[PDB]
């Protein structure tokens, strides 16, 4: 099934039920949770249980490739060519797909599918960090998946 998976891993699986998990993304640096606001702003300043911090993560295909959607706003977390995190109504593009990684230090990292070198990241104050300045070892790119409250 290796070849089959390698092939299927290239695009969205349009023939299978796509699994959905719901949780909060805790930022290691900010101590707070990732949230998508009504004004389409994205940051990591939400307190535990904040309605805007409830995320719906749907698998795209194999390799833990998923889309991250704010349950409250229905907006997808995506990355543009400048490595900027943007909230979009339509999350069909690869730019809205991230590979969930379980790092060697046991923290979670989310690597963008379109721009393979860029990671979802936030600063100590919970502000968005441009993907261009992100590297896997930085604490800004580390997260913990937490149960919804």
């Amino acid at each position: 099934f290796t070849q089959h998976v390698r092939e299927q891993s290239l695009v969205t699986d349009q023939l299978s039920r796509r699994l959905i998990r719901t949780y909060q993304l805790y930022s290691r640096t900010s101590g707070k949770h990732v949230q998508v606001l009504a004004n389409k702003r994205i940051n990591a300043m939400a307190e535990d249980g904040d309605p805007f911090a409830k995320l719906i993560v749907e698998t795209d295909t194999f390799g833990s490739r998923v889309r991250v959607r704010g349950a409250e706003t229905g907006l997808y977390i995506c990355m543009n060519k400048k490595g900027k995190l943007i909230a979009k109504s339509n999350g069909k593009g690869k730019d809205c797909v991230f590979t969930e990684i379980v790092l060697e230090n046991n923290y979670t990292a989310l690597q963008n599918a379109k721009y393979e070198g860029w990671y979802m990241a936030f600063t100590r104050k919970g502000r968005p960090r441009k993907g261009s300045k992100t590297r896997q070892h930085q604490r800004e790119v580390h997260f913990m998946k937490r149960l919804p409250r």
């Binding site: 099934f1 023939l15 039920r17 796509r18 101590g31 969930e100």
Partner: protein, 197 residues
């Protein structure tokens, strides 16, 4: 001369510490005051004793810190530092969440999906239970040359549970069915046979 006061509200602003199991957790409450204030730590509002956890804990007064090594889920809770001298007493509470992590490929429940037999026109189902920290993707595959079939399922706290229903079975439905699961680490799959009589 002066009551206790936090000298670095920076670190303290990070009230919630969510970390993976086996990590060392260090809580700090840098304090000032004259004379130098003393510090005590509480777990869930009560005195934190060495015997409250395996391996106890350590305190570095010079860094106003509480250190807990190789944390486990039972370490979840609130930790309060109480700093005080003659001119006053203040406290700050941190919250700890510990999550067990796994850097392994998916694990399926042995025996599922189970083999099944039915008379033509009858109904059958196949179940698969997948355990995976990293979000997995699951496909039901008919060995016909592989045909991906669409199934139903539900997500639960500790596993994905999927079921594939095959109604009004025909002889054509007979064959091998596979539940293939994969995450960012690797893949795993279990197969079953549908016998039509």
């Amino acid at each position: 001369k002066r009551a206790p006061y936090w000298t670095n509200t920076e670190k303290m602003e990070k009230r919630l510490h969510a970390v993976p199991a086996a990590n060392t957790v260090k809580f700090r409450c840098p304090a000032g005051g004259n004379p130098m204030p003393t510090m005590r730590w509480l777990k869930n509002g009560k005195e934190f004793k060495q015997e409250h956890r395996i391996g106890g804990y350590k305190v570095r007064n010079q860094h106003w810190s509480l250190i807990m090594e190789s944390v486990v889920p039972s370490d979840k809770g609130n930790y309060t530092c109480v700093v005080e001298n003659e001119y006053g007493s203040i406290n700050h509470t941190y919250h700890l969440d510990v999550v067990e992590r796994s850097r392994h490929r998916p694990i399926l429940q042995a025996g599922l999906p189970a083999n099944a037999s039915t008379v033509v026109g009858g109904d059958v189902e196949f179940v698969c239970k997948v355990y995976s920290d990293a979000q997995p993707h699951i496909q039901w595959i008919k060995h016909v040359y592989l045909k991906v079939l669409k199934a139903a399922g539900v997500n639960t706290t500790d596993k994905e549970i999927e079921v594939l229903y095959i109604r009004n079975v025909t002889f054509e439905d007979a064959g091998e069915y596979t539940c293939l699961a994969g995450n960012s680490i690797g893949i795993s799959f279990h197969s079953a046979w549908l016998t039509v009589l």
